[PDB]
Amino acid sequence: MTPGEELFTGVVPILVELDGDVNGHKFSVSGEGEGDARTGKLTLKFICTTGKLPVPWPTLVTTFVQCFSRYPDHIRHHDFFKSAMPEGYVQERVIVFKDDGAFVTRAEVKFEGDTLANRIELKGMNFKEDGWIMGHKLEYNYNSHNVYIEADKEKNGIRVNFKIRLPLKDGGVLLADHYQQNTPIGDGPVLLPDPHYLSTQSVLSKDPNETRDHMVLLEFVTAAGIP
Amino acid sequence: MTPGEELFTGVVPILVELDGDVNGHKFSVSGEGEGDARTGKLTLKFICTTGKLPVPWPTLVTTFVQCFSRYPDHIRHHDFFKSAMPEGYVQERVIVFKDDGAFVTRAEVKFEGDTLANRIELKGMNFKEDGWIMGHKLEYNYNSHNVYIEADKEKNGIRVNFKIRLPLKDGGVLLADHYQQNTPIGDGPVLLPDPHYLSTQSVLSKDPNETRDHMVLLEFVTAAGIPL
């Protein structure tokens, strides 16, 4: 086990902060919660601090900490995400929404004191202004996914490509293609893995006492397919 | 006609600089040439100054100055690109190669003295290291396309989208979707167009005497699709 992996033996507080600009509409989101990598369980709550979120909450779930995946403790494995800690990793995505616009995101995931922090900047371009995203036509729900991890030896990190199906309020799905790379922030050695996948299930809900625009997230993340 | 449009009555020298990183392979490209917006004609030559270019030249053509498009009289009032001059505009793209990786680019296009300068940063992610791009399976050749332009009134700029077909050596094409946004650098007024398109044609060639990895580009671009 690496020292980074051992930072996750307990339940770790999480902070998320996102600065976003979609079709010129600027917005910010703060999140708070905690993660238990022993079980793969994450609880997170997000509040749009700038007023109404200009995109549907489900389009941001993947952007809002895969270092909390449950990896099998008694099977040999390389956990890139935890082993990069505490100095952390940069997580970059392009997300392409079919027949709509694209997100470009850059995030730093690292310890700040005792807290695992995910700090993101997001740029959205070419969204249809009365389309499914800008028009808030997505159902407030979320599907489970398998996402396949592979080593990126040239960048001493990992790459991930995966498809998300976002259900529409009135029936149908919006496909969202995710292109992801993760690279360590520090100089020290990191674990690069054999190909495997992370299995994610997520439950979205609301707090009746929170009048701000917000999202309550419960998530389970488990590694598998480990050669 | 705006003062920025009038900076293009003659033949304007062009400088291009690109700072790139694809799958961790860093590379730089310098270009020089000139543009004639009266006819829509561009001539540019690019030299990889870091050695071998790690992607095929055709994948970079769109990244390497739409202010040289020929806007006819009936639609000059739609010419955002020239009206932003001389202070210029930022051009941002996401480019998605079908079943391959993505480029993310940001460029500043502006006059530097009497030269029109395109200065670009490019980052490419998730390319298959044995796919058509990284394995250099694209034909050194180029197709004719339509570039769709609309006003982005929220950002005082324009939104641009189009699909390029990159020819493959053994036949067929690799599709590349372009998501584009342009916003002025300065604060003064710009022309916000009605929806229209640019029609493009390009020819790629080589200089037998240039030992460095390079591309010679001839390009013709004309605006069309006049909404009354």
The two tokens of residue B42 are 């561009």
* C-beta separation of A155 from A146 below 8 A: no
* C-beta separation of A164 from A146 below 8 A: no
What's A37's domain CATH number? 2.40.155.10
| Domain that residue B67 falls in | 3-224
- In eight-state DSSP terms, residue A57 is G
Distance CA B68, CA B57 (A): 21
Write out chain A residues lying below 8 Å of B24, CB-based.
152, 154-155
List of residues 6+ apart from B152 with CB closer than 8 A: A23, A24, B158, B159, B181, B183
Question: Which residues sit opposite A12 in a β-bridge?
Answer: A35
To test the contact with chain A by mutation, choose from B126, B150, B152, B177 the residue with the greatest count of A C-beta atoms within 10 A, namely: B126
Distance CA A76, CA A227 (A): 9
Number of domains observed in the structure of chain A: 1
Asked whether the beta carbons of residue B25 and residue A155 sit closer than 8 angstroms, the reply is: no
To test the contact with chain B by mutation, choose from A55, A98, A125 the residue with the greatest count of B C-beta atoms within 10 A, namely: A125
Broken C–N links (> 2.5 Å) in chain B, after residues: 64
Distance CA A65, CA A69 (A): 8
- Give me the total of CB pairs closer than 8 Å, taking one residue from chain A and one from chain B: 55
Q: B222 — alpha (psi -120 to 50), left (phi > 0) or beta? A: beta
- By a Cβ cutoff of 8 Å, what residues of chain A touch chain B? 23-25, 92, 94, 96, 101-102, 104, 123, 125-126, 129, 152, 154-155, 159, 161, 177, 179-181
To test the contact with chain B by mutation, choose from A129, A163, A179, A192 the residue with the greatest count of B C-beta atoms within 10 A, namely: A179
Give the closest of B25, B96, B179 to A125, CB-based.
B179
- Helix/strand/coil (H, E, C) string of chain B? CCHHHHCCCCCEEEEEEEEEEECCEEEEEEEEEEEECCCCEEEEEEEECCCCCCCCHHHHCCCCCHHHCECCHHHHHHCHHHHCCCCCEEEEEEEEECCCCEEEEEEEEEEECCEEEEEEEEEEECCCCCCCCCCCCECCCCCCEEEEEEEEHHHCEEEEEEEEEEEECCCCEEEEEEEEEEEECCCCCCCCCCCEEEEEEEEEECCCCCCCCEEEEEEEEEEECCCC
Hunting for tokens 């202070």 — which residue is that?
B87
Give the closest of A92, A94, A154 to B94, CB-based.
A94
Write out chain A residues lying below 8 Å of B92, CB-based.
123, 125
Write out chain B residues lying below 8 Å of A25, CB-based.
154
Burial A176-206 (b: 16+ CB within 10 A, else e): bbbbbbbbbbeeeebbbbeebbbbbebebee
Search chain B and give the residue with CA nearest A91.
B125
User: What technique solved it?
Assistant: X-ray
Write out chain A residues lying below 8 Å of B192, CB-based.
none
Give the closest of A101, A125, A179 to B125, CB-based.
A179
